Design a protein around this ligand. Structure first.
Ligand SMILES: NC(=[NH2+])c1ccc(C(F)(F)F)cc1
Lengths: 350, 13
């Protein structure tokens, strides 16, 4: 066979994974079942680090301790649509319950008359997105180092019946050791089988989402294929100016690869970017092991990645606590808190 | 030709 000895080690390794995930699910459930840890005036606001339709993320400094954090601020009056609301509750509850080396750590959450707040660990190395766009593309070993962390993170999340649903370089921060921190759980959801919301980012949507089919955690493995392609090529596989054109390309079932992609890489991506769910890697009898044991990952020491023992390909420069040099600049708008509570009943659970 | 800037997610397409 392909493995000689090496097969016994891999099997024992797989059994240890099971053991780890069983303990991880016990810890998750304790926090999921039995979960206002601060207020706004406990923080100095320093700089906007990112913006979206519903609010912004700011670097803040805790007045008492002097620790720096990333504060996600959501305007309750922009979180209007039904699924926008449910998703905000998913995000908070999931983040407070998970624990994994490549997932950002939530520190505080609270709300006031106008906004919802989630205060998480600050990751000063910046978004993968901006490093990727600056250099163009990552070499295959570099992309593989990041991909391995996502594989392990999705193995963890899926074992807790959590689907992530917004994988992309914008959501992956680089920490001071050069490892990944997944940092936005706004589309994550606990799903025991299928779910039906039409949501995500166009370039990363699995075909079954676009086709309004009930779908499962395999959409994350499709998105992993998009991510690895984008990291190694510098652009994603389904690439067009308008969302409707992107959707047509995704559903077609056709992917073209750069001539510099290794044959091992193309093989992996053809099995991830597989429209047929009975054939998509991650969704088969052997689950995530079809991915972890693929030839493209032959050099990957999965345990060593988890334990953060592998030397990173890139270490971001940091000038000191609070440094924002690895982030882009954004327009700064004052945080105004209304005198009257807004949307109290719709966010009573937050 | 495609989108090169940051991409916004959609909560309900
Ligand atoms: N350090 C952080 N946890 C953090 C920083 C920036 C963003 C952004 F990508 F939205 F900009 C999100 C989270």
């Amino acid at each position: 066979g392909h493995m000689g000895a090496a097969a016994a080690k891999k099997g024992s390794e797989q059994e240890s994974v099971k053991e780890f995930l069983a303990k991880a699910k016990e810890e998750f459930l304790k926090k999921w079942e039995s979960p206002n840890t601060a207020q706004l005036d406990h923080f100095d606001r320093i700089k906007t680090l990112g913006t979206g339709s519903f609010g912004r993320v700011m670097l803040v400094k805790h007045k008492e301790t002097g620790n720096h954090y990333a504060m996600k601020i959501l305007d309750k009056q922009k979180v209007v649509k039904l699924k926008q609301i449910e998703h905000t509750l998913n995000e908070k509850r999931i983040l407070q319950a998970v624990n994994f080396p490549f997932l950002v750590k939530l520190e505080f959450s609270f709300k006031d008359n106008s906004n919802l707040y989630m205060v998480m660990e600050y990751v000063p190395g910046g978004e993968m997105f901006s490093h990727l766009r600056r250099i163009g593309r990552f070499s295959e070993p570099h992309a593989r180092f990041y991909a391995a962390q996502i594989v392990l993170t999705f193995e963890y999340l899926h074992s807790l019946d959590l689907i992530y649903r917004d994988l992309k370089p914008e959501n992956l921060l680089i920490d001071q050791q050069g490892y990944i921190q997944v940092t936005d759980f706004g589309f994550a959801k606990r799903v025991k089988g299928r779910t039906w919301t039409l949501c995500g980012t166009p370039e990363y949507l699995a075909p079954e989402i676009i086709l309004s089919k009930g779908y499962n955690k395999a959409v994350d493995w499709w998105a992993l294929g998009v991510l690895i392609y984008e990291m190694a090529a510098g652009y994603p596989p389904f690439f067009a100016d308008q969302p409707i054109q992107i959707y047509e390309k995704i559903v077609s079932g056709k992917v073209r690869f750069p001539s510099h992609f290794s044959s091992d890489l193309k093989d992996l991506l053809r099995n991830l970017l597989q429209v047929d769910l009975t054939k998509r890697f991650g969704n088969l009898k052997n689950g995530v092991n079809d991915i972890k044991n693929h030839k493209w990952f032959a050099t990957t020491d999965w345990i060593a990645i988890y334990q953060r023992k592998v030397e990173a390909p890139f270490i971001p420069k940091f000038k000191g606590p609070g440094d924002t040099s690895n982030f882009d600049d954004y327009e700064e708008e004052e945080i105004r808190v209304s005198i009257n509570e807004k949307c109290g009943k719709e966010f009573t659970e937050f | 030709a495609g989108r090169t800037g940051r991409r916004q997610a959609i909560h309900d397409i």
